[PDB]
Amino acid sequence: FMAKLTSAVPVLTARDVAGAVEFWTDRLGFSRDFVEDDFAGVVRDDVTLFISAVQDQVVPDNTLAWVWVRGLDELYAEWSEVVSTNFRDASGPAMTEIGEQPWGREFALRDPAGNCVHFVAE
Amino acid sequence: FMAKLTSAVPVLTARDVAGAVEFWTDRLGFSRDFVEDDFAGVVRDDVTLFISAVQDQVVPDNTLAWVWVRGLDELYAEWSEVVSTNFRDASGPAMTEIGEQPWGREFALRDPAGNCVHFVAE
């Protein structure tokens, strides 16, 4: 008899949770799972992400997450029309271009709070 | 044709990645998946956690993750013999006691780097 770990949920951070949730749902297509004032959960297909409140901006600026997807080029097309593809010369939410990395074919997305999330082709 | 998100991997943070990895593997039973100098991955059963390097200690002190498990009381017993159960009066790695929260029956564990990970009974 040994304990089995079954699944994990990344936690993104934000000084402004409510705005982080508005962005992931109204713009990226996730749904609200639950929303407290300093803690929320959003969901899309089999992926859940939690969003937690923090006071220091450097935390969200250093927060990361990796998500796997079937149909990466299409996610990229779906999101490129609501998120800038000029990842460098941009201050707000942005997306890098698809490229190969050791973990696979991917692209990263920075949300309004500063979280950087990597989406990888399954 | 719509992109489907299939799974996610939480990213823990540490000023000292190598030590964070030693702890999650030699003491908690995870295996090394890959180890670069400022980025690593550990695995146990169906759960993978990445560990990333940062310079500011406040990031790991604010980093969170949620993991689900079958056989929570047994994970608690397996880990209570290598991690302190005096969560308050302790400075290093520690574990709180099992309690009910809105997300379910759980316990939290703080690792040496400062990450706080919640383990929930499936």
From Swiss-Prot, chains A, B:
Q: Could you list the residue ranges forming a coiled coil in this record? A: none
Tell me which Pfam families the record gives.
Answer: Glyoxalase_7 (PF19581)
Give the species.
Streptoalloteichus hindustanus
- InterPro entries according to UniProt: Bleomycin-R (IPR000335), Glyas_Bleomycin-R_OHBP_Dase (IPR029068), VOC (IPR037523)
According to its UniProt entry, the protein's GO biological process terms are: response to antibiotic
The entry's protein name is Bleomycin resistance protein
List residues of the VOC domain: 4-122
Q: Which UniProt keywords apply?
A: Antibiotic resistance
Keyword check for Cytoplasm: no
The UniProt entry, under CDD domains, shows: BLMA_like
Q: Which family does it belong to?
A: Belongs to the bleomycin resistance protein family.
The UniProt subunit note reads as follows: Homodimer.
What PROSITE patterns does the database record attribute to this sequence?
A: VOC
